[PDB]
Design an enzyme around this catalytic site. Structure first.
Site, PDB file in Angstrom:
ATOM      1  N   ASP A 169      47.439  -9.615  74.591  1.00 27.89           N
ATOM      2  CA  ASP A 169      47.875  -8.352  73.991  1.00 27.89           C
ATOM      3  C   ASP A 169      46.714  -7.900  73.088  1.00 27.89           C
ATOM      4  O   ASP A 169      46.356  -8.588  72.131  1.00 27.89           O
ATOM      5  CB  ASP A 169      49.138  -8.583  73.170  1.00 27.89           C
ATOM      6  CG  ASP A 169      49.768  -7.296  72.682  1.00 27.89           C
ATOM      7  OD1 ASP A 169      49.119  -6.225  72.756  1.00 27.89           O
ATOM      8  OD2 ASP A 169      50.933  -7.366  72.218  1.00 27.89           O
TER       9      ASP A 169
ATOM     10  N   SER B  85      55.444  -3.056  68.220  1.00 32.57           N
ATOM     11  CA  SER B  85      54.382  -2.057  68.400  1.00 32.57           C
ATOM     12  C   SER B  85      54.203  -1.250  67.120  1.00 32.57           C
ATOM     13  O   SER B  85      54.143  -1.803  66.015  1.00 32.57           O
ATOM     14  CB  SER B  85      54.717  -1.082  69.553  1.00 32.57           C
ATOM     15  OG  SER B  85      54.558  -1.654  70.833  1.00 32.57           O
ATOM     16  N   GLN B  86      54.066   0.061  67.321  1.00 31.20           N
ATOM     17  CA  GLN B  86      53.954   1.067  66.286  1.00 31.20           C
ATOM     18  C   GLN B  86      55.138   0.866  65.315  1.00 31.20           C
ATOM     19  O   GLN B  86      55.031   1.177  64.125  1.00 31.20           O
ATOM     20  CB  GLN B  86      54.022   2.447  66.928  1.00 31.20           C
ATOM     21  CG  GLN B  86      53.387   3.507  66.094  1.00 31.20           C
ATOM     22  CD  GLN B  86      53.609   4.886  66.649  1.00 31.20           C
ATOM     23  OE1 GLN B  86      52.740   5.436  67.317  1.00 31.20           O
ATOM     24  NE2 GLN B  86      54.781   5.451  66.390  1.00 31.20           N
TER      25      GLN B  86
END
Length: 197
Positions: free
Chosen positions: A159, A104-105
């Site tokens: 996603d 993710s991030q």
């Protein structure tokens, strides 16, 4: 398990040969996230505990959701801590091979830090697996300024971060599978590729 400070507490008299630096994604705890402990373990099985340093990015990295929308994936304070963990690893254990991974991030971050790293240090990150790369579109699938053959972007279809938006959807959490397979494999394979038998 979820918090790992191998570099931070590491004593160079006893440096590990392989050093993993992972950036967890948003909202998760510790510094390792949900997928990190998996990789750490697969890496450790291949290297023995003694042979690899597992360090997650903590400190200024908060895993704060809003930051997923800052100009380049995360915040300056994040990019900074990760960059400093790279220097620290480099300085503390010079002759050690490095691997960096991110979800993710965490991956938005890992690309940011590696993209503005001192090339020479960047030269020694043998492989970087990203999971649900929230910047997968914008950076055309690569980590801007890293050798493409070293980047393994686990962007599962379905996603939405991989496709250009912040819309979190179901597939964005279908990563446990890869974190116990192709991800650490790719790394162990890349590290043994720059070491021995």
């Amino acid at each position: 398990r979820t918090t790992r400070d191998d570099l931070i507490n590491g004593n160079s008299a006893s440096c590990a040969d392989v050093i993993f630096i992972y950036a967890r994604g948003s909202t998760e705890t510790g510094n390792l996230g949900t997928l990190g402990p998996s990789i750490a373990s697969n890496l450790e099985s291949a290297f023995g505990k003694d042979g690899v340093w597992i360090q997650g990015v903590g400190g200024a990295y908060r895993a704060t959701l809003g930051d997923n929308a800052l100009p380049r994936g995360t915040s300056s304070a994040a990019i900074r801590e990760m960059l400093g963990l790279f220097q620290q690893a480099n300085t503390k254990c010079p002759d050690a091979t490095l691997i960096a991974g991110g979800y993710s991030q965490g991956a938005a971050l890992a690309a940011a830090s590696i993209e503005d790293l001192d090339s020479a240090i960047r030269d020694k990150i043998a492989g970087t697996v990203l999971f649900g790369y929230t910047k997968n579109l914008q950076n055309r699938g690569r980590i801007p300024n890293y050798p493409a053959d070293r980047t393994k972007v686990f962007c599962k279809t379905g996603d939405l971060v991989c496709t250009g938006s912040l819309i979190v959807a179901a597939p964005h959490l279908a990563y446990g599978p890869d974190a116990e397979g192709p991800a650490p494999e790719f790394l162990i394979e890349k590290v043994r590729a720059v070491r021995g038998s």
